[PDB]
Amino acid sequence: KKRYVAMVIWLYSAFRGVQLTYEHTMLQKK
Numbered sequence: 001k002k003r004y005v006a007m008v009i010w011l012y013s014a015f016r017g018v019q020l021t022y023e024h025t026m027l028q029k030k
Helices: 016-020
Strands: none
Touching: none
């Protein structure tokens, strides 16, 4: 298991599934 990565993974997996993926239409495929 990770610690420094498993603790920040939230931010590393939030700016992607809530920005470029949040759109789900425009930013989705672009």
